[PDB]
Amino acid sequence: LVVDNGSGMCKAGFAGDDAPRAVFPSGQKDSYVGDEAQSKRGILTLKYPIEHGIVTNWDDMEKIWHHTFYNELRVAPEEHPVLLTEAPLNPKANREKMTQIMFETFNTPAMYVAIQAVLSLYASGRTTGIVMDSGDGVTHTVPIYEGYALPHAILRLDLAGRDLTDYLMKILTERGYSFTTTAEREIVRDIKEKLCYVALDFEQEMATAASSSSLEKSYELPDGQVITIGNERFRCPEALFQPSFLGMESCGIHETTFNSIMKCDVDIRKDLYANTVLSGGTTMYPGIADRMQKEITALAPSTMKIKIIAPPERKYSVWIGGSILASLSTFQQMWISKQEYDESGPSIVHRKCF
Amino acid sequence: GMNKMVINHLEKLFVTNDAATILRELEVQHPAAKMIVMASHMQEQEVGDGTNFVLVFAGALLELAEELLRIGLSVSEVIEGYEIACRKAHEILPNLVCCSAKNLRDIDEVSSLLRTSIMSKQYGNEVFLAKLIAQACVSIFPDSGHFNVDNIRVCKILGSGISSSSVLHGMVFKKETEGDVTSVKDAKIAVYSCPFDGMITETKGTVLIKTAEELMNFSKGEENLMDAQVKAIADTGANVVVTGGKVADMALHYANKYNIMLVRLNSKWDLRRLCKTVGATALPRLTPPVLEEMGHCDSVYLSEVGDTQVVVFKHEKEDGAISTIVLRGSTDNLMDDIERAVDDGVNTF
Amino acid sequence: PVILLKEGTDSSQGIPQLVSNISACQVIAEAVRTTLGPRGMDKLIVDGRGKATISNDGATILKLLDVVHPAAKTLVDIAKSQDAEVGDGTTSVTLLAAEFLKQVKPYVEEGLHPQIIIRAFRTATQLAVNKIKEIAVTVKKADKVEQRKLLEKCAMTALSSKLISQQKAFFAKMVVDAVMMLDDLLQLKMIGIKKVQGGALEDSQLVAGVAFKKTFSYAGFEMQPKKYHNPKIALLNVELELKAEKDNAEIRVHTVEDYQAIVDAEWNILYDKLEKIHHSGAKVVLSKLPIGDVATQYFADRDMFCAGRVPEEDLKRTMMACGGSIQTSVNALSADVLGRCQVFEETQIGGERYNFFTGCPKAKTCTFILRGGAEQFMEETERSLHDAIMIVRRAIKNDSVVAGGGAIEMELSKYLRDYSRTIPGKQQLLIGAYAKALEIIPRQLCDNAGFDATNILNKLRARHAQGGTWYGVDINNEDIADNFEAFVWEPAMVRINALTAASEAACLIVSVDETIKNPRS
Amino acid sequence: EWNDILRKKGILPPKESLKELEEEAEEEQRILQQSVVKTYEDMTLEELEDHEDEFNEEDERAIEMYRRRRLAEWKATKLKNKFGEVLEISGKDYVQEVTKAGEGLWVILHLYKQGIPLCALINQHLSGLARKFPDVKFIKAISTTCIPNYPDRNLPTIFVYLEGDIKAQFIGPLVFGGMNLTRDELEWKLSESGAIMTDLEE
Amino acid sequence: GRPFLIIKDQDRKSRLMGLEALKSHIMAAKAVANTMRTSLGPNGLDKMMVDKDGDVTVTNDGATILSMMDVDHQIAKLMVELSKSQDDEIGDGTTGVVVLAGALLEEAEQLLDRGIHPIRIADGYEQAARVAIEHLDKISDSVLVDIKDTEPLIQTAKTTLGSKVVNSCHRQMAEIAVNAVLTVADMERRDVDFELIKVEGKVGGRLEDTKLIKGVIVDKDFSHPQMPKKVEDAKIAILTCPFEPPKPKTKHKLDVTSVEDYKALQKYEKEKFEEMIQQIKETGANLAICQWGFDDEANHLLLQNNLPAVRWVGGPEIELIAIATGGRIVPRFSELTAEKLGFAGLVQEISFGTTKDKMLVIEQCKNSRAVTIFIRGGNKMIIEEAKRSLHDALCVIRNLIRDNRVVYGGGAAEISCALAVSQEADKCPTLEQYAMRAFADALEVIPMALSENSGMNPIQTMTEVRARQVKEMNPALGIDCLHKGTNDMKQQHVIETLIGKKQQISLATQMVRMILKIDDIRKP
Amino acid sequence: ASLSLAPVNIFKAGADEERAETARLTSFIGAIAIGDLVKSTLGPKGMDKILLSSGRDASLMVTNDGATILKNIGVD
């Protein structure tokens, strides 16, 4: 079972597969008998119970899980160890609650799950390096050393690409034709996914887009118009970096990353200095990498060096990490199985020791 | 002995002559080597000093084993041979016990007793480290409880030669107070475990304002209630305030109004050991405690120790419950080596 | 079979390593073999972001340098230990270390054991410290003005082997008047410096009061009076701006009259704070927190100053200067909590506007206005004056001073070799090598000055064989003279720490047997 | 472990490559060992004179065929041995041998002025070469009567002609300078012209 | 021993040390100084250059040229920094000081090949700068400038505009600059902040149009374009808040629990609007000066109220309007009264005819404090050139606020200081005369490059002028700046600053003393 | 004196300079190019040209006066 409840999707294949066989959209056999038609359409009706990186409902998840691999994946999990994903951060309460339902309705032999950041780091082929988890709705910092995520080192910041688009449309009223409707929100996001790059900085980009006006790109779109002088494009990333644009004046994300690295011992930061890979969710355009590189280089001592890593595609990265860990051939040493579930319940999960 | 500079795959330069520390640094992939190194590890756990003795003994035993089994012996008979010799040693070694340490209390007594284990370490002069370690250990001599290694702390400070080092009965920390006053003697200590701001309820609490007067009196009543709480705390006669949670500035200003020392720590270990050495308590609320559950200290300072500033808790009676050692060295690795030597001495004691 | 350890190790041992250690150290020293000494030389290193840096005290450069070797890192750490302990001469301490290692090469190649070697260092250093303390310099004055005079002489010494040796008297009296104006608490946060482009060294000035950079100001500024022969200062840790109350105070009213009442009442709070400030009778309102435009408009109507979101260091220096007290709420202002000054004005100085306070009775802090022609030059000056401050703070406790010119090494070597006569065995050999390593230093100084040392070194031996003290080397005259009468004085604690840490590092380095590389996963 | 799992999934590290090169090289090294015995009976033309140490069986079909091909080869090669003395034709006829010299026959057109040990030794070497290769047309003469007032500082210049096309050039002593120059080196150069197939160390 | 990695990554590690490093320094610095030669002082040319983004900018304001270069060597960046320092100090000699530094290091490289420690050269340069500045202060003449006499200042600015294309008109700019300085100066404090002057320029027009306006210029048109366009003397008010109903800066949720609440709010909205109208109409001020814009209801009401106003006016321009009008700042109608209002001299609307820009000027009948300078010319290059030139002129006048801020320039000061340096140096022992003579030579470098730039036969020119000014001593015999004979500068009267040349000398001496010391180098 | 290239590389990549008549030649070649580009159209019997963009629908506009002509072209 390489099922992985992603940000909004669940993808079911096997560890050895190159990809999951089925998707989770939240009439193949539906004209022969119709037995699974009702079950799958009912499961389809149920919604995604995960928001902002924390579980919010529990009955529906098991409701969906039952069907999703009892009617198309055709697998008995009693004869299988289990490997799912989870929301980026939760206290032990959700973990030990999910263990109860999993065992009491499936009684599967063993289990192990990990934070999505670890899966992404494995997919990129790293066991080290902090990744900027710029997820939807909210972003987080997860410095990974050797694979395990530090419970004392996770920082959470409320920035979102939705917020960037909203702030753009908060300064698109100053552009004349504002944009607020569903179609207008969609076209703002479309233009953002077309061009909101970073060259170096706000004022110097605006000068070269207004004094010489050589950064203009005419929008010949059925849903768009030539209303950008090169300002609004670059006006999306700026609030991504400088908080006071949005009106919530606080420290920069770079500050949060720098502190989350400095609080640890300097030596291990070297390894964190090594890769320092990134992740999407709110960032898709270049100019991010070198800009944040130099921006944190201002915060980084000249005696030490820093690296920036960003793969172009990270869509099944958690799935790749899961598939790799399923074949790591040492993760079974950390399986939590019936031998401990029926012995101690959820207490060992709580780490009664230390 | 001779020090063995080793560099780990994490690029930390370990200048180690401690065979236990050496093996901790060593990365070996021979399973029998893993057997032997873990054996030495548990040995150091039980005793601590001279882990290399076990190594050399096992090596000599194994080479003799290779010799005898190359002669043509079988496994069993010679196994019982070693075992009989071992139990013979088991019984005969106690007969060789020559003397027994007495009273573990006279300072030169314990100094000479521990300088033996220290002498396996740095050779230039152990008697100085012997004096320091004896002064530290004897001061905290348990009567009916149990001596613990956590009852002794360590304070390394980069600086001049090791000769300009001493011991301190109390604790030292790398912090600077937010209090406008610095030096208090016979201060009254009110340890707090709760966050120092206005106690924030665990559920979302929302202010609901309807009329103007609600806004008008809001800040005034808030600061007055804060002043009431801080005044009630001040009424116990406290001269310092200790807390670990998030701090609020209004409290600092009020403390200035009352000339109150404020200190914020950062480690739960620190709070626990401070309560152990002063007898105070971890108060879950800001409410003033009673005289019984507080800690009393002879003098507290922010004393400068060589162009490095530290908060110091010193008891002039020098009784306390935990003592730490000030260390002055030109390099960190010298600190590490002396620290492990002191570890050997304290395990000896 | 199967290999013991992980692949990627390295194992070189024996005399090979020992020699291979010493040599490395030597390299570093010859890189900086010309800096210290009142001649003085300057380097230049550009790395990474292209930031150039210039210095003649080696600790800074070596920190800018990035090096990976146990011997090299040990040298870096002992140099930083000397730096943080007292200060200047870090060049000299690294040179002395390399001189130790170079002096004892043959013993490493010959038959000798590290035990005898290290005990020789320990005995020699013990005796050197005893000699230093026994013939230390005492003035028998115990007077404030003579204290300041000696401080000025030692400050000129600190600026010797630095870049501003011409202005040594000027900056020396400047920093002495700075420090003697301070208390005996040795706090070093309170003497911050505000650096300025343009102007020469004599144009740089020390402010008795407080000068800080006038930060960004909103519209309506400069309407306030720019001169007050007796203003009053109101330091604030409170924010003045029309904002949200606590981010959770939700309105749920249904009558628009109450709505307008709430708005007007928020304005009432604003104007209440304004009136409370106004009744204080003060004219200078500063703040670490943002100040709204309406506040400055009111102040212009009320004809008084304004400044906000200033860094905390600035307000704390101001609090220590004016003798006032920082407030947090506007509800508790008194006639003595506020700050008081004798003259306050904003001035234009070489292309910027600063806020100035002077005449305060509470003279307990100062700030430097530096006028320079080069950022490299400016930061070299700031670090040199910081060194002078450190020297002064060490010396005011006690006049543990040593004359300049490097003759001190001649007294040290004279005493060592004179002592190195009765001791038998290779102990005497090691003490003689230890003495020659010391002997090298002023030859290092003077050959950089461009003239022979051999004859003057023999003259030094002759002069010191019968009781000559600190008859050091002349610098721009290439001769010999007593630096105690030439009035270039360095602290003795410097050299005591130097030789103690040098013995430390020497015995440490002599005391290794092998090394093991690891794969660096 | 992890690296090989990477290998199944990705190719981000390379470590399983280039292990086919030495494999194929060793395969060819073992393959090329049968060429010694493949043509053992196909090279020597004295094996008939090597009776009682070369005979195991005679099939008389391919082996008499080998005699037939061998004798055809021998008659073809010995019908061409007509030379061996470098000859001195005159400049009057010169046009008739620069062009009418036979197609398919190499012509070593030597030009020289006698008197210098350079030219004398070169003439000696080519005359001795004529004793070995009587299938090569040698020409020697005085360049003055071959080319009018030819620069005497440009001798001895070796010419290699066939069908009026210059194939190889060796102009002046700038490529033959030195009494140390020898028999085999001249033969080597003329082989390098493409006329002769032999072997030499250098 | 086999070589081993001591320094981290010695593979990409490049070291230079010794005399060769000084050779590299001197060669690069001589190349730069000779690069920056042909713009000297009162008469020269202008160097044109384009930067990374493709912008054409040409001037003899040397600091800009050096700043806009993507140079490679460090010493050149140091030169750029020195140029910026001198420009922000005075604003003239932006190339004079760098050419002087180049001359000093020419002398340094000559004496270096003679085998002497650089400390000697630095000491000689420092002593020579001491002597030169001391005599330069002895020779400058005090200028008695009052509030009614301007001719010496007019000639000062006129001479200052030499080699700067703005010398086309060469006369009116001096007058308008002096008038602006007088209007805006804070006499008692001796202070003039240039943030009080809105240095503006618009392409087109002519350099004759270079004017000073004794008031403020604003670049926003009517909120009601149909409203009457111009008003004579008026009364203004400055409101820092829009015309929207007062909503607090705290998140507010106003419930509406009844339909009569809806009626109450829709009535209170207008009631507030016309209440604001009545408030502002009562005070009698003709004009309203706001910052954040407002709603069209206010526009039509003022159309029915005939009371002019503007909106979205920026911060600094708001402040300047307030400064010029003499009033105070009114945050809200509570502070609104007839007292704090500001009286207007006259206000009018222009559009520059063919252009579609709109721009309001405020010219005051009563006393003003903030003036405005406008420019008309050939292109943005012309506009920026005039802006920077006049700005440097304002810096010159601000320096000239005091007396004795002028000495005869045009190169004559260079001859005088060189003569004094030689005279003092000759009566000295050895080991110093060489460096001091080197400084002297660096001093007469300036007149040599001056004569070169003018195209005059150099060496004979300097020889004859030196003989003339040696045989009879005066500070006014410099070489021809107007190139028409009459080298007696008591006729041409090159009238330029004292502290400018003194600061150039000090900066050059300190900078060469600094560069002399960097003898060991390290690059990656 | 005029020399700014022989001693050392005082320029980064793509940075150059020209002091002597070379600079004048470059400027005048550009100016004469402008003139012939424009003098072929002046007068009441002046002539006309066509301005064509590089790609992107090939913006076509006919014009006689040289203003828009000098606006569109990339002058160097």
Residue numbers in the entry:
A (entry chain S): 8 to 33, 48 to 375
B (entry chain P): 51 to 399
C (entry chain O): 5 to 525
D (entry chain Q): 9 to 210
E (entry chain M): 13 to 536
F (entry chain J): 2 to 77
What does the paper say about this structure?
ATP-dependent chaperonin TRiC/CCT partners with cochaperones prefoldin (PFD) and phosducin-like proteins (PhLPs) to facilitate folding of essential eukaryotic proteins. The ring-shaped chaperonin TCP-1 ring complex (TRiC, also called CCT) is a ~1 MDa hetero-oligomeric complex that has a double-chamber architecture, with each octameric ring formed by subunits CCT1-81–3. TRiC-mediated protein folding depends on an ATP-driven conformational cycle, which regulates the opening and closing of a built-in lid over the central chamber of each ring.
Briefly, human PFD-bound actin remains in a high protease K sensitive unstructured state. We used PFD-actin to generate a TRiC-substrate complex followed by the addition of PhLP2A and subsequent incubation with ATP/AlFx (Fig. 6a(i)). CryoEM analyses revealed most TRiC particles adopted the closed state, with ~42% of the particles containing extra-density attributable to PhLP2A or actin encapsulated in each different chamber. Further classification revealed clear actin and PhLP2A density each occupying two opposite chambers. In the closed TRiC chamber, we identified completely folded actin which indicates overall that unstructured actin was transferred from PFD to TRiC and then subsequently folded by TRiC and PhLP2A upon ATP hydrolysis. Notably, both PhLP2A and actin interact with the positively charged wall hemisphere comprised of residues in CCT 3/6/8. SD1 and SD2 bind through large surface contact with the CCT1/3/6 wall, while SD3 and SD4 extend towards the center of the chamber without direct TRiC interactions. However, the presence of substrate caused a dramatic change in the NTD H2 to cross the inter-chamber cavity and stretch towards actin. More importantly, in the presence of substrate, the NTD H1 helix was resolved and shown to be in the trans-chamber making direct contact with folded actin (Fig. 6b(ii), c, e, Supplementary Fig. 8f, g, Supplementary Movie 4). The cleft between actin SD1 and SD3 contains a hydrophobic groove which is the site that binds the amphipathic helix H1 of PhLP2A.
